Subunit: 458 residues, 4 copies
């Protein structure tokens, strides 16, 4: 059993090591001691989870949202793009600003920006590095950053490396909290009051851990109300919007017609685009600022030709209409999941199971591939184990977050209605079993009995 | 021709922009003001120099050290690598510690680890991200970091985000400074004295800025002597060693047999290996440390199959010996340059008067090996003149100036590659001696050199 | 029946074409990708709506403002104009400044000029080409243009090609915004401070998009205060005013007695005058500027005799007073509409909740006059539902949406014509109140209204 | 008489005006200053020349190439076309894509396209607007435009408005320059090299200023060689070819059998077709591209029925064979002119006094064009004009602001309705000019002016 085998390795990985580290050098003892801190809570990460790719579990976990990886469609365009460039120069040769620039990557960038409705684009090795560059290079002394509390890890790191004086979180997707944070921030800085510095607003368009969507039109209207002099600028991380939201996959910003109102956008390749990389979107002033003040970009090797070609190939497919049907299939399958799971209420009334993104899903203009499923914090591992032993691959969400743990289901275009049925039934089995147990605090459910057994066994 | 066009485009990009932004929104005014800061010292970067790629100028500037890029050898081995995996799964699917792990990347890392004498390898999308991960995940509270002053920018970004309380720089490649740094750090930290924490030493095997080599065997001795309880660990950034140094381009650590002495090694793919990416070498304790405490690795998409394949391909060409002749031709051409330029008649007079200086060429005959990095110094007031003199002669070299180094410490970096020729080297030596001659005559007679007249004329026009 | 047919054809035209183009030449693949851009927001336009012309739907959408088209009144006067010149030389023979000038066109321009109270007139083949010529020929290097944000597309095209250094927009019909724009431009340009160049002010008399009216008197006084040197000039696009506003349809500038104070006026023939073409009014200096510096006029064939004839015929019908009854009936029917819709019981509730909005209808009894243009707003999410509701109810209204306006600003434009009737207006009011009633019940009860169900079913069957 | 009266007004027009404007508003003074700038070089345009129409001068200037206007033949068919449609709806009602479409215009368009051998056709108010629409809507970001340096004003305007990154002119009708333009363009862009963007090639089939013909077969071959992936597209402006070149007037593209190889063609009505309008020819992909991305078309009034009817009438006459004789007569009269002027010549041409390049190797041309440009010394150009005019021969002067200052010339237009006797008179008047200018030259007196100029200079001194 590839699932069970991965389980025993994960079991064996949580065994404490530093008790056996007494004769060992201080450096290695301190490292294994720090690894033991995570092994103690059994939160050590080692080899991850690969059953979703080999066919041994249903893929409700991965970031291959459009199934461009699964089907080989991105690979086929990539090799074809390469074939149309038989003598391509593989190596950039150096820094993007110190000799590593070349026509192909500049043209691919502009082709991407034209597709997304932006003036210019600038390519990074990842979404994370794009966020790092944005919040390192862009904010000025005196600017403030007002951000959604659930922005990405890379956004938090970047803001910490920023020149920005004041950074303020606001409650997730909450319009009143955003208005409070902006007003108070406006009321505490005399160079924001007179418009010589700016309020930077950091949002995700689709939140990777909650699946909700940024109400961008309403936030823009609030920003103007609070900042009548126009001294604000939105920064929108679209990692989970590109290819999934908006016509032909263009993203939330362009779907809403906001490409001229949103100063900086991040569109990453690691999810629906089934590869790696990112572009940062903005005008030439924004682009020049990254080229000159993002030390990370200045001092790293510019992208190789195939890294650019594979990104071109994903945009080729979205541009030529080749992802529209997969994108519609995502909407269909997610809605179908919501329809089923909500039809089978008790467990939700009690606290056993909760899917916040399924509330009022009917009134949503669209849905997202991200389905976070909450249980009781004491039950989260058991929910994870229940689904995995059912041969359902999901991602457990726990160092990443504060008693905020949950599982994240990812619905992909390549999933089927039958697999969704199987997931709905499995979740109901897990529900029913936890209401039974609650209605002997030592009682442990079926899946967790097997896991605890393998823990005793190895 | 082309070189003049690039220079005009460069000149125009330094023209102040804030005077034309008074009606713009705040955000955009202040960004152009920040950019005007750089423009005003003529230090704004936009598209860089491209004449080396086009043939419009000799390549004494790129990082394609073994010319694996120029020849198409890496491209050929890369496409053949994809060919052997006809239906490869392109996408990782997520983070390396969530859904994104797979057999091909684990096996390619292990091939690399085996070939480089390391227990394990862990792949990142660049050398820089490898340094970020090491110094954010490895140092513990109470550790100290003693680093050579010339470590890479990304190691500075790294250390500043680390949990270590003490970071101490030593004068570049100075053993006495290193000894003064280890002892004063040790004696000032009781948790280092009793051996409950470690001193982390940060070096480059080949320093990209100066081109000299780390005295690692002697640095290790100083470290054991200063830290008797063995609470130290060496971190070697081998970005400019891999491919250029050691048998089959294994780098400096393995070339000296120190693969068991150096806890953590960084091997990048952006120079001699002619792609992007990097591997961090260590034992499984180091590796798992990176996978669990390098938040930058945890929250990023794991490399795609073509990314792993091109790295596997570059190492392939090293493993099989297909890079040996290219590695030997760097040693040859570099020694050829040194022999040629030092035999020049102006050489003594230029270096005597202070008009030219090539520190890496001092006593090159005693060196066991040489490197591809040849920094050339003139008088700071002549530096841009030296740079455009070469440029006008259709020789691409790299300009080293602010914001990369302090103002008043500008130089030029000649980079010698496998695919350069003795003809080109001769032309370079001849061009440098002509610049040296011209400055001698100016100093021995408000005259400016010919290269300076040409820049000043372009500046008057643009 | 026919409404459904065109809706199917419209749905089919939005289906993406690029996936079928893989083996086509580069040129053709890239045009269909470009077209797929618009298809992908269901924004592709092909043949538009025709039910209003065929009697299959009531005409609340066309630009045949005085119904001179519908009744054939212009056709008859045009063929009579031809009959009075039985040997007419059809062909101009070349450019208007290179051998295509002739007496008949010069004399028709002068008749139009005298009737509209302007020194001269210069004829173009469209209002658009008139605006192109004005803004490429007139502004000088150093001049500035301050334009209402809602000026016509052709004016945006003319301005982008102009010689003027500064183009400043101002908030639509906003006197405070205009003052800020005039003063900000005045205080940033020394060439305007010493009176060596001019501020050109660009407005519409009747804004095609909103149906409101430019406060021309207030704006001229603001210009005189900010420009005490008198170095300003007004340019008024009267496209939707001629035939509708002012005695015998003379338009807003002559109605206000401003023909001495507005340097350049554009009167188009494509709406109330029921044909095509335009004239630019000014003195002989303005006219000569256009004939010499408007490269678009210089390098195009001067109008044919039948083109001039139909324009003269439309102006005859206005000069003789034959259009005054039709002009007055627009006032009546529009006033009849505002009476009915703002008297419905659902009106307060619909407008309070934001389910219906008709800005132009507010305080309409105080306005000196009304216009034929009646924009109706619902929730953005409900817009196409409202449009299809009207269409299924066999009422032809104009859809206002991207790429014509920004996304999220979509609305519906009702066009009230002289040949509409109170019964038709009754049906429109009742149909609107039916939509508002239905959305009220939905918002108080994923329920979609009836019109949305019919369109969702059509999309299911084809799309 | 009127020839002379035209002169006096044209003389009076050039009198500077801004000196008398010291007290005028800035706006009006600056405009009259701008006019003075043209008046200074005797280059202000006002009323053109009409003597060719009234029979006061021989028409060797106008664009009525087939004499369809002169004979009233187009007028008769036009009125007959209208008569076959007794209840026609004159007014389009609005935008072609927003409610102004109708059956008759779509059918006339398709009838034109079928005759010209094209898949579809799309009607514009003029040839210039057709060019504007093509070059604004068609080029994509990343495409290049390689154009003959002598393309039309409207092509230059349109290109300036396009999304195209690279525009490259090549030496007129020169296949070497065209190949060098294509090669340097293909080798400067990697998206052209991989066939993901296109090179658009812009030519006239018959150049309005030079009378020579585009060597379209060889250019297509050069393009195929330089763009092996087929990522190019030709755009052929046939304004001066329809009705004049090709069997039954079909134009150059169809004559050569290249209708499948030219992506886009422009066929205008203002010359041989003797009215106004144009169509753009292409497949349904090109036509939809214009309908959606030519904002000039989207935001203007669709053509009225009589505008469509008169274009149909022109094509009816070509389709039914009723212009073939006139077309043949142009060929006859043009060749007769070349034979006469060639057999008089050598000395004038050798000295630089007179040149007619289109007369070189005129025997070895497959056909000739109606455009005959006549060159003298730049210092003698208006003098040649005044000589021809006072001889009662109407020709068109071509100078700044239409061509560069030192590229001035006179354009003779030969029409089907001219006679051999008029050609005799033209040849003799031209030889008298040449012999007079030869003498004046050989006399050494740089202050001597010719007989025609004396009368003009005298007319100037008087008024
Ligand atoms: C590999 C981790 C991927 C991942 N998210 C990464 C994100 C990143 C980082 O992008 P990346 O370095 O993978 O190219 C930025 N922004 C958002 C909103 C993200 O969700 C996820 O699984 O939810
Ligand atoms: C693009 C800049 C490359 C560059 N150096 C990058 C280095 C880096 C960063 O490598 P990278 O992020 O490009 O993969 C780490 N260490 C050392 C010693 C380096 O020299 C150089 O030009 O010397
Ligand atoms: C085809 C009809 C267009 C149209 N308006 C055209 C206008 C034009 C262009 O007129 P056109 O070229 O049709 O003769 C100029 N100015 C204003 C204010 C216009 O409203 C409309 O429907 O509102
Ligand atoms: C006003 C008439 C102009 C004129 N030609 C107009 C042309 C135009 C413009 O056509 P138009 O707007 O008069 O219908 C396009 N292309 C070419 C080649 C032309 O020669 C001429 O006398 O040659
Ligand atoms: Cl920096
Ligand atoms: K922008
Ligand atoms: K019809
Ligand atoms: K027309
Ligand atoms: Na944009």
């Amino acid at each position: 059993g590839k699932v069970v085998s991965e389980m025993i390795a994960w079991i064996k990985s949580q065994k404490l090591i530093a008790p056996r580290m007494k004769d060992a050098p201080t450096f290695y003892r301190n490292l294994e001691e720090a690894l033991d801190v995570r092994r103690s809570t059994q939160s050590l990460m080692t080899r991850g989870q690969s059953t979703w790719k080999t066919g041994d579990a249903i893929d409700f976990c991965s970031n291959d949202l459009l199934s461009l990886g699964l089907t080989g469609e991105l690979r086929r365009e990539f090799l074809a793009e390469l074939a149309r460039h038989p003598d391509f120069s593989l190596h950039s040769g150096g820094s993007r600003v110190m000799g590593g620039n070349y026509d192909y990557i500049e043209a691919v960038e502009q082709e991407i920006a034209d597709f997304l409705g932006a003036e210019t684009a600038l390519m990074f090795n990842s979404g994370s590095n794009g966020n790092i560059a944005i919040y390192t290079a862009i904010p000025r002394p005196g600017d403030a950053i007002v951000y959604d509390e659930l922005v990405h890890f890379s956004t938090h790191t970047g803001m910490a490396a920023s020149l920005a004086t004041t950074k303020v979180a606001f409650r997730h997707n909450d319009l009143d909290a955003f208005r409070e944070a902006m007003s108070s921030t406006m009321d505490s800085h005399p160079m924001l009051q007179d418009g010589s510095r700016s309020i930077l607003v950091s949002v995700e368009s689709v939140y990777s851990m909650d699946g909700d969507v940024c109400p961008l039109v309403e936030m823009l209207e609030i920003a103007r109300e609070i900042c009548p002099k126009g001294n604000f600028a939105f920064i929108a991380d679209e990692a989970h919007a590109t290819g999934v939201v908006g016509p032909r996959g263009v993203g939330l910003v362009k779907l809403l017609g906001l490409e001229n109102e949103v100063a900086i956008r991040l569109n990453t390749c690691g999810k629906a685009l089934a590869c790696t990389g990112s572009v940062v979107l903005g005008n030439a002033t924004v682009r020049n600022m990254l080229l000159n003040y993002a030390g990370s970009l200045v001092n790293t090797t510019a992208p190789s030709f195939p890294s650019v070609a594979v990104i071109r190939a994903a945009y080729n497919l979205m541009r030529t209409g080749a992802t529209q049907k997969a994108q519609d299939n995502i909407q269909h399958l997610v809605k179908y999941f919501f329809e089923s799971i909500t039809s089978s209420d008790k467990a939700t009334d009690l606290g056993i199971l909760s899917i916040p993104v399924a509330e009022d899903y009917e009134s949503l203009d669209f849905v997202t591939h991200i389905v976070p499923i909450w249980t009781r914090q004491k039950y989260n591992w058991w929910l994870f184990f229940h689904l995995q032993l059912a041969k359902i691959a999901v991602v457990p969400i726990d160092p990443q977050v504060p008693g905020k743990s949950r599982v994240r289901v990812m619905i992909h275009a390549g999933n089927t209605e039958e697999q969704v049925d199987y997931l709905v039934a499995t979740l109901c089995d897990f529900a029913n079993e936890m209401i039974d147990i609650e209605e002997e605090k030592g009682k442990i459910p079926k899946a967790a009995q097997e896991i605890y057994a393998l823990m005793a066994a190895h």
